[PDB]
Amino acid sequence: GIRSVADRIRVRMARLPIEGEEGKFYTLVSYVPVASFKGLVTKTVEEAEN
Amino acid sequence: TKGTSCRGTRHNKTHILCKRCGKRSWHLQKQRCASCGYPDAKMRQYAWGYKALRRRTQGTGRMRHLKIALKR
Amino acid sequence: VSLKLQKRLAASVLKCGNRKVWLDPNETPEISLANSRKAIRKLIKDRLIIKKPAAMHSRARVVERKQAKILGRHTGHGKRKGTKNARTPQKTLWIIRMRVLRRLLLKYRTTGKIDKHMYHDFYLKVKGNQYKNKKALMESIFKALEEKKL
Amino acid sequence: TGHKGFSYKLKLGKKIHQNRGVPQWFRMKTGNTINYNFKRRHWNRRKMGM
RNA sequence: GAUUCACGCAGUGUUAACGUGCAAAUUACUUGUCAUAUUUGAGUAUAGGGGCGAAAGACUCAUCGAACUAUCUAGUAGCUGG
RNA sequence: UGAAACUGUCCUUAGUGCAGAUCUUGGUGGUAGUAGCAAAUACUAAGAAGAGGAAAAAAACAUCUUAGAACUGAAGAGGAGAAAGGUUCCUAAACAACAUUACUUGGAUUAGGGUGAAUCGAUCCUAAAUUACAGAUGGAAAUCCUUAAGAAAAGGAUUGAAAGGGAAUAAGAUUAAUAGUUCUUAAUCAAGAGAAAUGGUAACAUAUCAUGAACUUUAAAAUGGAGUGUGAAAAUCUACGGAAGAGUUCUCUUUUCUUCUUAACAAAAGUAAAUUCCACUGAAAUGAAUCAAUCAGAGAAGUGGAAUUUAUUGGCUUUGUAAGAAAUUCAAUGAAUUGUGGUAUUUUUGCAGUCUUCAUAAAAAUUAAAGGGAAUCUUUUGCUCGUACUAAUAACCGCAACAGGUCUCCAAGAAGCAAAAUCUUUAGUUAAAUAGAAUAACGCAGGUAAGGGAAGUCGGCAACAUAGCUCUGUAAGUUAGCAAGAAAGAGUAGCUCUGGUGAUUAUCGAAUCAGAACUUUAAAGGUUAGGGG
RNA sequence: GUCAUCUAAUUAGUGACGCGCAUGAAUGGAUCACCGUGAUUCCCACUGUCCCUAUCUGCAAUCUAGUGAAACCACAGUCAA
RNA sequence: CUGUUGCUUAUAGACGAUGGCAUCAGAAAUCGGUGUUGUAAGCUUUAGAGUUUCUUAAUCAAUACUCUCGGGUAUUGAAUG
């Protein structure tokens, strides 16, 4: 609801080129649910897979 | 409550359009017209109402059958 | 494009409210061309306009409370709010009581258990608030019939 | 009201007819000063007293 | 023509809010009342030295110790301003 | 600068000289980019259209769709009417002005479209009341009279109600908007046209039947309120047997949720409740009966009948209507099903008697019957007018999209005595005089507090405090009815059990009361809810 | 007013006395049970009324983007005598 | 040089102002310390009054035992890294 939000939230922000113009960039913040926030640090996610 | 509140119940007409003068002056309960003096045969005119005489009288209308008679 | 006309038209064909109508969020150009009830009817059959189901209202919580209260789980002193006469009307307890007591005296008279003079005397005793329950009256009738043969 | 007399409705209809403006071709006559109809009213702006 | 609660209604108090206001009399809580001397719609009747009033000179279209409107009327002013 | 009239001298004439009159009319400043645009819980994300979210966060972005979160809480911010409004209704284009920002939005601009009746109302009747010819009065305009004055009207003139009376229509579907009005199907009503009957003891009964004039009478239309009991339908709840679809499913859940329907008008398999009459017989040892009553030798109870009412025929189930409709699913227009109950609550609707009045709680149009005895199925038509829309925190009255005012109909779940406060479902809406940042003083609204406890103050003003239910107990005074919920004291939760209150011959069903162990944070108090003497 | 009483303290309240400026009998005299959003006094309980103020929340107020009035105004605006 | 600007900046603050740092800037988690509350969810103690149902296995059962000095929160105006 509007009165309560989670104490901690884990997000995944991904900088991507804009589909219209490739020279422009935009962010896409997504939700990554976790069982607990213990031991979770700032992890940089580079997939780099075929 | 004699001002704004008391105006809410005003939805009952006192005067409606009259048949001889066409004005909304026909009193429904009194069964007479305040302006042209209905069913009374003589038209309602008063000397104190001199402006009321120059608003509806001879010459203020089409004069359909008298314009020819005086021209003739 | 404002789809107000199609939302209102669909709600009348679907015989529901405007809150129960679902228009496809990706096929807006197809829906916006439906400018008549006949056009909406085809869109409904093509599953582009569906009727939302009503929100579920479960009675499981209420059923449990009635089941527990049948065993007298919550009907304590601290959960009673109305007066004694309000919860159980005192007048209707009396209406029921001699609808039961007088039904027994009519059955006994018709079965030959008691005669008219005995039945009449017990009728005024029943009306006089003498027997609290059916068992109390049956005991008196049985007890009084033994003095008949003595 | 929903219920009305026959004469009252015709005088109601004429009030609709007279709530119009000057046609464009009339405004293009030579020496024309009539551009607007100052006998105009709107239902929420002025009651016609009838 | 008992005691109370409710839909409603009123207007006891805060002499609260507002007081170039939501409003030319309203809002919030509190209080009183909430069917027979009750509440209420429409129709109809009563008109200005008149009407109506469980009576406050109260009400009679925001106008009342005598309504509104037009004429007498450019009423009169030993008084005030120019 | 301006682009067609004007000037000097002498006499004559005057609407002849303005800084004021709270002067009149018009225009414009400081105030001032200031006071303000703060009642009605609230919006967020993605996409679409659009010139109209850009950017060194310019922290906010109108409209529409989806998702999340919410509010009105069914005496609604729902669905419909009367008055009032009058085109505000629908669609499309378009946004100069208006809705205290903005607007692609609009109850705003432009242009078209939209209101279908033999059955709904007006039209018809009269109520309070109102108005005519003749007559009476008056100087006068005019007033009186409404059947009394009349050579007027078998009998008394006109108007007066879209809430009083009243011939007759329902279901489904359809429109961008009208629908008891259109389409399909199915009916109904009115005005036409083509010596004169039986049956039952009786109450009374017979697909029109089975003649019935003048005249007269009776009845209906047509009549207060309260409270109690009860029949029936609907809604809600629930038991049983399933069919179809949806939700949950790592922890379980034979689980939770939704649909399983039916009109007007008629028919008569089966079968109810209540009241009033009829035949037999004659009641006392008086009976019969209700929740209460109440009734009987001018005649009870019992048996057997008759009639009326019970939202159309005849009340309920059932039937034609009629499943072909509609609802829920499945498939790519075509297929599946649509039992039976309840000794529960509410609403509606009748019925039965009781109470109450120094109150007794309308009339006519229109219809039927009686007394009387004068006389000898088919088909046609059904005219005039209203019909759109709001009915209100935006269409009505208040100068307005004003927190004011304005008559009604339908009405779910929880909980509780309760149509109370609080939460939710169907329906509606998220906008309703603009937002963002910071979180100073003084404010408006809601609060808390150490020790003391009215010492404040004109004054316990404002706030605090008591508060539901059960048991015990209750003073002086008194018009003997009251005071009285006087005052005062005790109990209340959860879990597991036990017993009482019925119907039919072991099963079936209702919440209500009382009691006992055990446990805990020791229990009316989330909301609602008397301070006392 | 004088006497009791209420309080530590009574121009207040209650109860008495009465040649009462100027009470008094349907201009009604006396008497109150029940009732009263009527006026006055005293007790218990409770509390920010107060000793004596502290602190919390929402809305504004502050600043900003858009929008944007009004009363008032002879001219104006530092003091002492 | 100074000012704007950034750290949604503080020892400051209505707004300005004022104070600090600005590439060895800053911010962020996470980790340890330090605090607040009182023993989380799952399975076990026949904990356990009792009623069911086999028949002397189960089931349901307020509350209570072990795991548990547990779990959750902790700058937001806390303090290391």
Side-chain angles (χ1 to χ4, degrees):
Chain A
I2 207 166
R3 288 187 155 110
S4 171
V5 201
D7 200 299
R8 276 170 185 78
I9 303 186
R10 187 106 157 137
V11 296
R12 167 131 68 82
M13 27 195 72
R15 207 202 280 144
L16 305 151
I18 296 195
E19 291 66 352
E21 207 276 303
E22 81 305 337
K24 263 116 204 176
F25 284 100
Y26 79 107
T27 321
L28 178 78
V29 196
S30 316
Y31 178 56
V32 183
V34 299
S36 184
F37 286 83
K38 305 286 196 173
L40 284 201
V41 278
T42 84
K43 150 202 313 173
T44 311
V45 181
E46 281 56 20
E47 301 91 22
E49 107 277 6
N50 283 290
Chain B
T1 74
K2 55 174 108 164
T4 307
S5 317
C6 87
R7 319 260 177 271
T9 48
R10 320 177 60 252
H11 54 102
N12 295 302
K13 276 166 178 146
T14 287
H15 292 109
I16 66 171
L17 302 174
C18 180
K19 198 193 211 169
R20 199 166 73 191
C21 37
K23 279 169 95 151
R24 187 177 83 154
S25 277
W26 169 263
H27 197 341
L28 279 171
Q29 268 187 263
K30 283 195 201 208
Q31 285 166 117
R32 91 170 319 263
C33 182
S35 207
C36 52
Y38 206 14
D40 316 314
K42 298 210 180 203
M43 281 283 208
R44 172 208 183 249
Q45 292 157 143
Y46 288 118
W48 52 263
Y50 71 108
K51 272 192 190 181
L53 281 144
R54 65 151 89 125
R55 297 204 254 252
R56 173 181 61 228
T57 187
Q58 194 188 78
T60 62
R62 195 213 293 217
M63 301 205 68
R64 187 194 316 203
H65 307 275
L66 201 56
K67 82 206 316 174
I68 300 139
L70 304 190
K71 132 191 156 191
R72 160 168 29 208
Chain C
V1 47
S2 171
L3 281 183
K4 288 186 64 98
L5 166 64
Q6 280 78 30
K7 189 111 151 178
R8 163 179 82 81
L9 271 197
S12 159
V13 178
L14 275 178
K15 282 158 131 188
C16 64
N18 283 45
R19 45 212 299 267
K20 291 305 159 232
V21 180
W22 182 91
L23 315 168
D24 220 309
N26 303 304
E27 291 67 356
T28 284
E30 292 92 295
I31 299 179
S32 79
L33 299 201
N35 266 110
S36 74
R37 273 160 187 278
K38 157 169 170 98
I40 301 276
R41 261 174 234 124
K42 163 168 143 299
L43 283 192
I44 281 156
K45 136 183 76 83
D46 285 292
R47 310 231 38 80
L48 285 134
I49 294 172
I50 88 175
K51 180 164 146 163
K52 283 189 210 153
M56 304 154 42
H57 207 174
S58 173
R59 296 196 61 76
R61 314 201 338 119
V62 182
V63 155
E64 286 326 289
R65 251 184 322 243
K66 292 292 211 143
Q67 285 300 90
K69 255 177 176 119
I70 274 170
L71 317 176
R73 271 312 173 278
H74 314 290
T75 89
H77 266 288
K79 310 279 117 164
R80 290 164 174 162
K81 289 305 179 323
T83 53
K84 173 179 268 287
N85 186 289
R87 313 189 32 124
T88 169
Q90 199 191 359
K91 173 166 160 86
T92 52
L93 292 179
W94 166 272
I95 303 187
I96 289 169
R97 209 221 298 190
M98 30 211 65
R99 260 164 194 167
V100 161
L101 290 193
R102 281 178 215 165
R103 266 199 324 262
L104 180 78
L105 289 161
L106 189 57
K107 185 199 49 124
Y108 271 2
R109 200 196 72 216
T110 43
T111 332
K113 272 219 58 185
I114 55 179
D115 41 323
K116 52 142 80 173
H117 328 103
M118 169 145 254
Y119 160 82
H120 179 102
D121 298 3
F122 271 132
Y123 199 111
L124 292 163
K125 263 168 220 153
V126 152
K127 186 170 135 54
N129 187 36
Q130 196 114 31
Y131 318 110
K132 303 302 119 173
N133 10 78
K134 226 201 176 205
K135 262 155 65 200
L137 164 64
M138 294 198 321
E139 275 150 46
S140 279
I141 275 171
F142 168 81
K143 217 182 109 68
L145 271 187
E146 311 325 314
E147 287 88 62
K148 274 292 300 313
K149 43 100 170 184
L150 280 168
Chain D
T1 39
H3 321 286
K4 29 182 93 82
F6 177 48
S7 323
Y8 185 49
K9 185 181 134 189
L10 302 196
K11 309 184 172 15
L12 275 196
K14 199 195 186 101
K15 281 304 198 117
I16 277 161
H17 191 65
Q18 302 180 335
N19 210 33
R20 307 184 88 153
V22 201
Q24 189 57 225
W25 57 263
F26 198 94
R27 305 185 54 170
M28 280 160 17
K29 284 188 204 218
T30 60
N32 214 229
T33 325
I34 302 185
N35 301 326
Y36 313 125
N37 195 35
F38 55 71
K39 296 195 180 209
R40 262 203 149 192
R41 41 143 267 279
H42 213 38
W43 63 274
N44 57 336
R45 290 287 134 256
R46 181 199 84 100
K47 307 299 163 183
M48 51 205 198
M50 80 157 304

